[PDB]
Amino acid sequence: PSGVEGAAFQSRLPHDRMTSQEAACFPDIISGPQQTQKVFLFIRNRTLQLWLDNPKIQLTFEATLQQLEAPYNSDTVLVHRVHSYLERHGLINFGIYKRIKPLPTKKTGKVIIIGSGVSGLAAARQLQSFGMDVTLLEARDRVGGRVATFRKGNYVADLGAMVVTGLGGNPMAVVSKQVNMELAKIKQKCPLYEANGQAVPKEKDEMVEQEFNRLLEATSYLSHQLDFNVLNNKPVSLGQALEVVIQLQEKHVKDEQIEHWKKIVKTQEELKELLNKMVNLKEKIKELHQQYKEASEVKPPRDITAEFLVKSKHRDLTALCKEYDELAETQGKLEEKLQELEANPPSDVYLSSRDRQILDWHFANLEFANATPLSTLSLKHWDQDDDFEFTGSHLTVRNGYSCVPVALAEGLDIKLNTAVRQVRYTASGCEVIAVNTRSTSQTFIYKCDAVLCTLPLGVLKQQPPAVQFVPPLPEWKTSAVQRMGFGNLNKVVLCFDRVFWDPSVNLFGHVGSTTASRGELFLFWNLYKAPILLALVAGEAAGIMENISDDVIVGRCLAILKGIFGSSAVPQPKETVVSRWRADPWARGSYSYVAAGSSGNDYDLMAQPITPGPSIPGAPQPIPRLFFAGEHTIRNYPATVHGALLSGLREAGRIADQFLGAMYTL
Amino acid sequence: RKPPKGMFLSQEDVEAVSANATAATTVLRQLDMELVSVKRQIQNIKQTNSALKEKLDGGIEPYRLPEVIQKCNARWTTEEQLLAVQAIRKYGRDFQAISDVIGNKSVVQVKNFFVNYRRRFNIDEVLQEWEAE
Numbered sequence A: 001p002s003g004v005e006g007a008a009f010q011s012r013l014p015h016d017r018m019t020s021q022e023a024a025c026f027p028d029i030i031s032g033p034q035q036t037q038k039v040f041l042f043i044r045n046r047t048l049q050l051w052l053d054n055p056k057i058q059l060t061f062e063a064t065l066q067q068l069e070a071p072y073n074s075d076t077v078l079v080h081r082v083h084s085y086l087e088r089h090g091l092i093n094f095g096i097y098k099r100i101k102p103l104p105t106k107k108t109g110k111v112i113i114i115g116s117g118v119s120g121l122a123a124a125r126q127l128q129s130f131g132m133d134v135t136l137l138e139a140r141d142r143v144g145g146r147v148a149t150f151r152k153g154n155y156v157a158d159l160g161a162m163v164v165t166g167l168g169g170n171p172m173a174v175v176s177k178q179v180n181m182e183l184a185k186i187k188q189k190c191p192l193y194e195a196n197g198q199a200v201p202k203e204k205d206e207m208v209e210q211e212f213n214r215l216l217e218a219t220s221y222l223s224h225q226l227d228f229n230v231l232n233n234k235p236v237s238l239g240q241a242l243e244v245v246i247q248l249q250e251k252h253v254k255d256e257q258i259e260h261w262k263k264i265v266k267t268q269e270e271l272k273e274l275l276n277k278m279v280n281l282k283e284k285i286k287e288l289h290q291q292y293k294e295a296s297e298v299k300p301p302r303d304i305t306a307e308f309l310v311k312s313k314h315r316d317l318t319a320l321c322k323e324y325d326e327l328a329e330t331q332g333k334l335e336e337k338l339q340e341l342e343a344n345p346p347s348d349v350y351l352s353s354r355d356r357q358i359l360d361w362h363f364a365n366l367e368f369a370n371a372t373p374l375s376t377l378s379l380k381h382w383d384q385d386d387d388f389e390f391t392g393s394h395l396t397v398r399n400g401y402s403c404v405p406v407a408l409a410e411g412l413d414i415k416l417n418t419a420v421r422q423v424r425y426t427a428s429g430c431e432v433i434a435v436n437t438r439s440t441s442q443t444f445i446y447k448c449d450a451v452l453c454t455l456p457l458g459v460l461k462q463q464p465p466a467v468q469f470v471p472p473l474p475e476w477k478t479s480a481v482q483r484m485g486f487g488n489l490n491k492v493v494l495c496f497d498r499v500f501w502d503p504s505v506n507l508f509g510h511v512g513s514t515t516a517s518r519g520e521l522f523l524f525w526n527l528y529k530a531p532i533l534l535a536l537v538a539g540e541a542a543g544i545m546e547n548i549s550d551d552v553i554v555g556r557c558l559a560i561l562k563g564i565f566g567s568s569a570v571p572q573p574k575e576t577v578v579s580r581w582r583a584d585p586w587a588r589g590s591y592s593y594v595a596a597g598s599s600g601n602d603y604d605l606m607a608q609p610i611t612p613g614p615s616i617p618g619a620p621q622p623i624p625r626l627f628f629a630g631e632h633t634i635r636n637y638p639a640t641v642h643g644a645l646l647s648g649l650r651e652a653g654r655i656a657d658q659f660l661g662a663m664y665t666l
Numbered sequence B: 001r002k003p004p005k006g007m008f009l010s011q012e013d014v015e016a017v018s019a020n021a022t023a024a025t026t027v028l029r030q031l032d033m034e035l036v037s038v039k040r041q042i043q044n045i046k047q048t049n050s051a052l053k054e055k056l057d058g059g060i061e062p063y064r065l066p067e068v069i070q071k072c073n074a075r076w077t078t079e080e081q082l083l084a085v086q087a088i089r090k091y092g093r094d095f096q097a098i099s100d101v102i103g104n105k106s107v108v109q110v111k112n113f114f115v116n117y118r119r120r121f122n123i124d125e126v127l128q129e130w131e132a133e
């Protein structure tokens, strides 16, 4: 889409309808006459367009009113309301832009941000862009959180997020214009190779893949058309659902051979009863022939009774000779059906032993996308975010996707090596209590109006708690934290000095010998300038390989590569890195997933901010003091860098609205 | 609304496999056993029909009798009359057969015979006697 309508779509907004949020800021216009709505909707779409067409400079209200034209630029307050709404919730003037209007001399309100991950940084920048005092507290010695980027020599490789999922509606699209990102398209072609190190032939590779996709659909049928979502008081997972579907396909295969051969016995037995009619008829024809013989040897001249007896016996034998001929037509027919039926046997198996192993690879990569073993994904809700998918090719980042968080951190107050350890929120404000990660002795106290928590969900999940909330988080929040799922994924960075793989493939698979190890080193990526291959450890395999060292893991990678390219063709790597995200205590995993017995609604619970009790009992209902963002807090686009980024912009708007007031709602 | 093509997922079937953890394998063992049973019951009858197939060697080609080709005259010799009366008593009312026996009278004359000479050959009685068997 192009024009002002493309701006709406590139901002994840319907161009022709007012959103639930815009209703809340403009409740006059939405209840108002349908014409004003179109005016408003144009003013919004146009302003989005202006921002989008150049996102390296601030879009001031004055600038916006200038490129508007009558009748739309008649009402200036409508334009000021719209511009400010957009500016507040980060639909314009977000990311890294040049300040037409430089900052206010004096800040208003003080807010602490736990975590310098993308979520964090994006809110931080917005709050500081709004003129608040912002400070970020970061346990790591670096920014970016789970967007990490190994760098040594001219070797570069993300240990963290590495894929941009398509620029059609993606806010990272704006950031890429703002920060140079060498963005390179992912060529989707992926050759699979088996254990022996030989490629799968295009016959299987397409047959199996198509079966996979068909199997997935099958579960959706089980889910939505048969309401197979609970089983023995527990919720059904995608894994179960897949097995049930596989078993029923293997059942139908047997059901099909049974009624096939039962069509054969029904015919063999029809033939058995036909032959006994034929033996017993032949034995009567044996006997009349003798009788007609015997009676034809009575040499004539005969009396008419013994003439009648020759003629009658002759009639009888030619009538029994007629029967036996018709019955041998009928045995010709039936003896031919058996030949055909035997020649058309139905399918021997559902899936061969090799077939099922290629299938496992399509499951592994499926588990690799969602970072968890399928046995955990909720069948009903695992693809709930599929509806908001972006358009366009998928991409990777040659210069290392750390360039973005680092870029965002410019200008911001960031305390690295600062492990937050207790969060204290009360009617009158908040205290954050951190230590120094190097000497855990040296203690820090931070006072502020509000705390924005971008602590990873794995950390919020931790028992016993790595961060203590005082007072405790209410049940409705802690329960949402147990229900949700925190996955795991890991990678192995292989740094060579030769390119020995096909430089035209971005990625190629390795098929695993069992179902139990389907995720163990199942996929490799040729992504970079340097000779770097990158190898995934997904599914159940992810958390198990974390209890093996680098060399051991590296040896298996060499092994698998040997198989596909020959023991000559692959040297020992110069530099090796292995990730352990479930091990890492500032992550405790890779990203969220929709666990069985969870739902999308928990992602909305994770965002609801916390409002403490009154200090003086009988005092008025205070302000909300504790705020949450991060990839686990954005129902529509979770487990993703953008989802983080957006949630950052979200809370920033919300906090500002709260401590700065929102004059645009009149 | 309908499952993918080549996917077989019926409501009846799913409880089927999901009543207990071993039920999925347990059913699929039933069908493996049903298959092998029918499978040998084929080679049983395959061999039973193999024996009966051998008893019928030579067909019935020794026992064939050449085709008698008679132009069909309409005069009635006495010989042809006596042949008739005997065929009646042995054949009831299968005129075709009776026509086959006499050999030069088609089936219509047999029926006309039955009434013209009905009094004199006492047909009625002969039929009761043929009805008695």
Ligand SMILES: Cc1cc2c(cc1C)N1[C@H](O)C[C@@H](c3cccc(C(=O)N(C)C)c3)[C@]13C(=O)NC(=O)N=C3N2C[C@H](O)[C@H](O)[C@H](O)COP(=O)(O)OP(=O)(O)OC[C@H]1O[C@@H](n2cnc3c(N)ncnc32)[C@H](O)[C@@H]1O
Pocket (backbone or CB within 6 Å): A114, A115, A116, A117, A118, A119, A120, A137, A138, A139, A140, A142, A143, A144, A145, A146, A147, A159, A160, A161, A162, A163, A164, A165, A368, A369, A370, A371, A418, A419, A420, A421, A454, A455, A456, A459, A466, A467, A489, A490, A491, A581, A585, A586, A587, A589, A590, A591, A629, A630, A631, A632, A638, A639, A640, A641, A642, A644
């Ligand atoms: C770990 C890991 C994460 C990601 C990826 C890989 C890995 C290894 N990649 C993978 O191929 C999967 C993939 C992807 C692509 C497309 C679609 C999907 C998808 O749809 N699915 C449903 C499958 C997935 C992708 C990728 O390619 N692009 C992508 O888009 N997404 C990927 N992802 C996720 C993002 O990486 C991640 O979601 C954002 O980074 C979130 O940022 P956040 O801001 O919420 O969270 P942080 O962790 O970043 O920040 C918190 C800060 O708090 C600090 N901290 C902790 N504890 C304390 C304490 N006590 N005191 C003080 N500070 C503390 C911490 O040290 C950090 O500094």
